[PDB]
mmCIF file of C-alpha atoms in Angstrom:
data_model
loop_
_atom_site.group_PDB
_atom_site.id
_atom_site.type_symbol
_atom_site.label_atom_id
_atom_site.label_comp_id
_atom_site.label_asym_id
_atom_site.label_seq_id
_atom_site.Cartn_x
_atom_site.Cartn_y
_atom_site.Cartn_z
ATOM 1 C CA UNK A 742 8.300 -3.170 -10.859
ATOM 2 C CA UNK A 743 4.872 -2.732 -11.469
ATOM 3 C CA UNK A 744 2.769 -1.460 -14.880
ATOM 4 C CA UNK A 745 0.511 0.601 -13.234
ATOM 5 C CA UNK A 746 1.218 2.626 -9.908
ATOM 6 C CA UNK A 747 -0.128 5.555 -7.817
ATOM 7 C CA UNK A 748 1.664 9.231 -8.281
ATOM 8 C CA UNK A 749 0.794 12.427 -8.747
ATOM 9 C CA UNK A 750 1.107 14.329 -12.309
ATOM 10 C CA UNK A 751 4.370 14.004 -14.665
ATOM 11 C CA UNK A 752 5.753 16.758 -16.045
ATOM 12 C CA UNK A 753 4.060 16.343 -19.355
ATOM 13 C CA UNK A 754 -0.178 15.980 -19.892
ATOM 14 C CA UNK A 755 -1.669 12.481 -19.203
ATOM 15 C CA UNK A 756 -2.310 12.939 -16.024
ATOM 16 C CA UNK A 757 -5.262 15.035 -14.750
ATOM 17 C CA UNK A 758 -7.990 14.580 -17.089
ATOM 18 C CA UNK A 759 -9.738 18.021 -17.560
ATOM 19 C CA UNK A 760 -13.277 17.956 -17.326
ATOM 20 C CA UNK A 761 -14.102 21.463 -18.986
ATOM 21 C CA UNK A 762 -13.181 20.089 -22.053
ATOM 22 C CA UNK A 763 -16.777 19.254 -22.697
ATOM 23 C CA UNK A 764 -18.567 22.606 -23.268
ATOM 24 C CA UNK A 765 -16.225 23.865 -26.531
ATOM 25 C CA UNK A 766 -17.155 20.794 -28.476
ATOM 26 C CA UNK A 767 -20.898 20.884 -27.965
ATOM 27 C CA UNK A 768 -20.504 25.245 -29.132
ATOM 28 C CA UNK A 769 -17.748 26.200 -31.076
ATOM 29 C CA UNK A 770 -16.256 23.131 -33.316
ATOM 30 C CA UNK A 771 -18.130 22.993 -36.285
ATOM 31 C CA UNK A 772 -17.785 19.761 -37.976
ATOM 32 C CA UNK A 773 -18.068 18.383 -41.464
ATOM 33 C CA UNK A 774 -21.624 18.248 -40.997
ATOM 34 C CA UNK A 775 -22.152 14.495 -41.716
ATOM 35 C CA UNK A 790 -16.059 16.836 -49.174
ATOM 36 C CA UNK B 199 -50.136 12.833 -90.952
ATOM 37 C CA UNK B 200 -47.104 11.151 -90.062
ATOM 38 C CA UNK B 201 -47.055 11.369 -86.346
ATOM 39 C CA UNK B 202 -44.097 8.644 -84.763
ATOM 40 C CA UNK B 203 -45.252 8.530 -81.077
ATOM 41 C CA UNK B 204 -47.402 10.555 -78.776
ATOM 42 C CA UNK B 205 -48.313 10.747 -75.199
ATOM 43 C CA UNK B 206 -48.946 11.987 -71.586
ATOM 44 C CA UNK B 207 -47.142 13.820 -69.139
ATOM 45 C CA UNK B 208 -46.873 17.020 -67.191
ATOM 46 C CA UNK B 209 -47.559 20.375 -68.318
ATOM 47 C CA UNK B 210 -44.520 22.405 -68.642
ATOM 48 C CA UNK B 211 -46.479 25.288 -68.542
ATOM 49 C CA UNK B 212 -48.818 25.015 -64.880
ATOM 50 C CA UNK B 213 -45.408 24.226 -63.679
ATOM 51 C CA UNK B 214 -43.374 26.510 -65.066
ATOM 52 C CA UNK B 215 -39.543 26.274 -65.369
ATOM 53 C CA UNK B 216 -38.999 29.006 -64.095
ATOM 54 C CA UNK B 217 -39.930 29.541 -60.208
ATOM 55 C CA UNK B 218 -40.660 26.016 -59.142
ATOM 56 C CA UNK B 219 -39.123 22.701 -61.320
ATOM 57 C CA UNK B 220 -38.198 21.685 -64.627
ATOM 58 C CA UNK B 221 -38.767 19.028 -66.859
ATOM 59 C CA UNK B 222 -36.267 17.953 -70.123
ATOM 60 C CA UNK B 223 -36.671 14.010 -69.006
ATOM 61 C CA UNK B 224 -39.636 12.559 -67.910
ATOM 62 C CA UNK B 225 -39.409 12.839 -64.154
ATOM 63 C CA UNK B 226 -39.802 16.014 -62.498
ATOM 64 C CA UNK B 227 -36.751 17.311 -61.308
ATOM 65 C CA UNK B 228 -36.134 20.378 -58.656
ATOM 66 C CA UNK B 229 -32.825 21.277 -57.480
ATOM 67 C CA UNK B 230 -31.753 20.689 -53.490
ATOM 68 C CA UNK B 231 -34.644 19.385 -50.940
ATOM 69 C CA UNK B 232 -32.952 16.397 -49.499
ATOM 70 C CA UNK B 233 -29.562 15.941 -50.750
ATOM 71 C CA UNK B 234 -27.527 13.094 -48.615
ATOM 72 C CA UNK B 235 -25.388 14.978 -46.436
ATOM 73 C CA UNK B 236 -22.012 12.763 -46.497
ATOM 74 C CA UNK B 237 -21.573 11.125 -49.853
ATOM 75 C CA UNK B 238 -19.344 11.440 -53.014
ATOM 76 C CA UNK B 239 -19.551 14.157 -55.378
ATOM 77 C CA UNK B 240 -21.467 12.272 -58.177
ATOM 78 C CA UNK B 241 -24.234 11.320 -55.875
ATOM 79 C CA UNK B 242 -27.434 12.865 -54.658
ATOM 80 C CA UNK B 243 -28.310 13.475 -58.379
ATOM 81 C CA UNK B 244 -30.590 10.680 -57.842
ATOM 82 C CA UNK B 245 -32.366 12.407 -55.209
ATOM 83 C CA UNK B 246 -33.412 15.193 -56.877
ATOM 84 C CA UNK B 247 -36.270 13.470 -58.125
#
């Protein structure tokens, strides 16, 4: 029994990294500005 | 006669209190140029000057 193995995605998300999660923090997340 | 201490500073009236700064202590002190953007509460009312 290995730790870390080869399959494809489990039926919850931690596999498949999404990639377009780059463009809404660079636009619309404003931050605290540095209360 | 009977003067305790005088001396030199700025003219509160060339810089008026008004539209510009202010001065009730010594230094003079305008309101919000460069505050320090992630502090406290209490702070950045040493900037001010």
């Amino acid at each position: 029994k290995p730790i870390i193995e080869r399959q494809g995605e489990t039926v919850d998300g931690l596999t498949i990294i999404d990639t377009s999660i780059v463009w809404p923090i660079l636009c619309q997340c404003t931050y605290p500005l540095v209360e | 006669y009977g003067a305790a201490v005088v001396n030199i500073d700025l003219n509160r009236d060339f810089f008026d209190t008004a539209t510009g700064i202010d001065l009730t202590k010594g230094i003079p002190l305008v309101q919000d140029l460069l505050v320090p953007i992630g502090v406290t509460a209490g702070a950045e009312q040493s900037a001010e000057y």
